[PDB]
Write a protein that binds this DNA or RNA. Structure first.
Ligand code: ADP
Ligand code: MG
Ligand code: ZN
Length: 661
RNA sequence: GGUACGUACC
RNA sequence: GGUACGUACC
């Protein structure tokens, strides 16, 4: 039966009376249950007053649509009202305009509403209540704020029709922590709180205060630790890679103004690779390309075990053999290419055997081991999460746990959890694969997640006894969310990091920022109504101006026979701009009748690459379309030469040219 | 593919 | 504003 707790009621009270508010409840409090109570109460009143009651619940992830239906929204509203969940994933055969007419409570991803609002029609007047789950994203150019700026534009247009009366929905913001917006001062922290209040049109932000004793007993915070590693072990792997990197730099004559295995080095060598590609300096760019891989190995050794650093290099040269070697069904090896390959093969014997000695592994891995061992022996049936930065680190830590049988002995049974986006070097986990791992984690089949930021917000994950942030420090919101996953009995939160990395210091800034947030919320709540209304109006007014400036900026092509495509590695003439066409208005393809002569095919739409004939540089991959084998060219791999200038682009849209169908 | 947000570094 | 890492939505 649908009932609230006393702290839940306290916070819900103004939204039941018909006021726009933001609800701030910690993780595990039941903010989604408060939403269901407010939606029924809102709709039950509209029945008794003989009026059109309609709710729309907006969420930031597709899994949350399914999730809010099963657990909360259907059980209490299905028999009494028409309820539905939507997303871009679900291929529905009804238009969203019609889905509005037919249903009382619509749970969906926020972009589905905006798609309809943009262009029978949909307007925000059609809904009487709008609930925005995870409402701290109602900011900048996000989907929530684009929905809300229409509401504010209608609010201003409504006062014009008072003087010369279009209806407007109630608004409910739901979140754990609103954030401070990277503010380093209490003034800027308060400014950010008022801005998201102004974005959601909240007449008051709401927190548990009177019944704060009940909330503290309901959700119990973990014990916070900070496991620092000074890293005063000898590192012969780092030293031996540096010697290789130093040898390569003397060959190509490219010297840095920065330390080896650092981020400013990574930026430098990519810029140097891009310069050397533009200026037809094959020697320099190939050395810069290889130097980046040796630079990756150093920073891989800094986070995960050095066997991974070896494999990153070892796989790179394995793929170079595949591309450079002339297979059947078809020299590529330059002096520079032969020099770099010999250099690896010479020092490959040592690096492989040096990597097998765990005395020279990273110290953070020993700290991670110690933290895992003592905490998984602590309880009968434990559960935990290791937050790491990269996808590679997540997979590599999963192998480290598996290739070390004392974790299997003690109780741990691990599995990685990563994103589904396709803009990384590491492969993605699909949304269905993500769903299956979190289910097994809850069931007990899986014991320990090694996740990226995928695991921190929104998704329903089982209560953890331990959550470790293995080197990862993001922002104040994500810190509270990661700490919020630890809510089992005798739970602990931990930050395993190197003192040299500066992550320990950046966490203390987030702790400082989290304190400013609670002070700021208090000050905005205590603020008198006239002072509040003035400030909320000012931010609402300048928020509209902000979009007009970006709209005019975005409002700011030529002719396709102006350009030609050179191979970035070897500078050979390949295509004119007239040869290009687009498929589905996204994937670009070359048409030229005698294009087959200039490339070869290798395995790793299709799993068949396209590489240069003369030099073995990747151009892209093949694809089937209407029973025709067509070559998909990725813009990354080409130097575009103009008639008037030579430049490289990362995306096809960055060109000042439109192409045919 | 497009777009959004987060973080570090310039 | 740029480079990368990360996550997401259509
Ligand atoms: N008033 C209540 N009475 C009984 N159970 C509740 C109440 N509020 C919440 N719950 C339960 O507690 C859980 C809340 O979890 P969740 O919705 O994930 O919280 P949040 O969204 O704040 O993280 C749900 O499983 C729900 O069944
Ligand atoms: Mg919930
Ligand atoms: Zn080439």
């Amino acid at each position: 039966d649908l009932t609230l707790r006393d702290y839940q009621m306290e916070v819900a009270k103004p939204a039941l009376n018909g006021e726009n508010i933001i609800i701030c409840l910690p993780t595990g409090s039941g903010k989604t249950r408060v939403a269901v109570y407010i939606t029924k109460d809102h709709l039950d009143k509209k029945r008794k007053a003989s009026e059109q009651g309609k709710v729309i619940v907006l969420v930031n992830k597709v899994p949350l649509v399914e999730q809010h239906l099963r657990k909360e929204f259907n059980p209490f509203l299905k028999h009494w009202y028409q309820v539905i969940g939507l997303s871009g994933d679900s291929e529905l055969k009804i238009s969203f305009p019609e889905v509005v007419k037919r249903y009382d409570v619509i749970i969906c991803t926020a972009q589905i509403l905006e798609n309809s609002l943009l262009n029978e029609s949909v307007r925000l007047s059609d809904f009487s209540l709008i609930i925005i789950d995870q409402c701290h994203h109602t900011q900048k150019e996000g989907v929530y704020n684009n929905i809300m700026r229409r509401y504010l534009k209608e609010k201003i247009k409504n006062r014009k029709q008072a003087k010369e009366l279009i209806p407007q929905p109630q608004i409910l913001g739901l979140t754990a922590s609103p954030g401070v917006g990277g503010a380093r001062s209490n003034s800027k922290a308060e400014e950010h709180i008022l801005k998201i209040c102004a974005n959601l049109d909240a007449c008051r932000i709401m927190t548990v205060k009177e019944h704060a004793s009940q909330l503290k007993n309901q959700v119990k915070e973990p014990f916070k630790k900070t496991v620092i590693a000074d890293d005063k072990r000898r590192d012969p792997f780092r030293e031996r890679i540096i010697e290789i990197m130093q040898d390569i730099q003397k060959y190509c004559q490219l010297y840095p103004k920065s330390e080896f295995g650092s981020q400013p080095y990574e930026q430098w060598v990519i810029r140097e690779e891009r310069r050397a590609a533009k200026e037809e300096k094959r020697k320099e760019r190939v050395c810069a390309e290889h130097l980046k891989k040796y630079n990756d190995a150093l920073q891989i050794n800094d986070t995960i075990r050095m066997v991974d650093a070896y494999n990153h290099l070892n796989n790179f040269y394995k793929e170079l053999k595949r591309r450079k070697t002339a297979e059947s069904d078809d020299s590529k090896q330059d002096e520079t290419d032969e020099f770099l390959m010999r250099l690896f093969h010479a020092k490959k014997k040592q690096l492989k055997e040096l990597a097998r000695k765990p005395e020279y592994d990273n110290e953070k891995l020993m700290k991670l081991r110690n933290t895992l061992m003592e905490e998984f022996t602590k309880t009968e049936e434990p559960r935990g999460i290791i937050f790491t930065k990269t996808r590679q680190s997540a997979l590599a830590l999963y192998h480290w746990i598996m290739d070390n049988p004392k974790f299997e002995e003690v109780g741990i049974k691990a599995h990685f959890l990563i994103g589904a986006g396709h803009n990384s070097e590491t492969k993605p986990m699909t949304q269905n694969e993500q769903r299956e791992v979190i289910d097994k984690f809850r069931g007990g089949s899986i014991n320990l997640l090694i996740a990226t930021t995928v695991a921190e917000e929104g998704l329903d994950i089982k209560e953890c006894n331990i959550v470790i942030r293995y080197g990862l420090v993001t922002n104040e919101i994500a810190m509270v969310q990661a700490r919020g996953r630890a809510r089992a009995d005798e739970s602990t939160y931990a930050l395993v990091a190197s003192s040299g990395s500066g992550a320990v210091e950046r966490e203390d800034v987030n702790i400082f920022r989290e304190n400013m947030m609670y002070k700021a919320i208090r000050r905005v709540q205590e603020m008198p109504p006239e002072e509040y209304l003035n400030k909320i109006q000012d931010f609402q007014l300048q928020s509209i101006v902000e979009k007009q400036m970006k709209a005019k900026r975005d409002q700011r092509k030529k002719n396709p026979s102006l350009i030609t495509f050179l191979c970035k590695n070897c500078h050979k003439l390949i295509c004119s701009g007239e040869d290009i066409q687009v498929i589905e208005n996204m994937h670009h393809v070359s048409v030229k009748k005698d294009f087959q002569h200039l490339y070869h095919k290798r395995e790793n739409q299709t799993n068949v690459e396209i590489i240069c004939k003369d030099c073995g540089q990747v151009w892209g991959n093949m694809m089937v379309y209407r029973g025709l084998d067509l070559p998909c060219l990725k813009i990354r791999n080409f130097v575009v030469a103009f008639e008037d200038t030579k430049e490289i682009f990362k995306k096809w849209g960055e060109l000042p040219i439109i192409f045919p169908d």
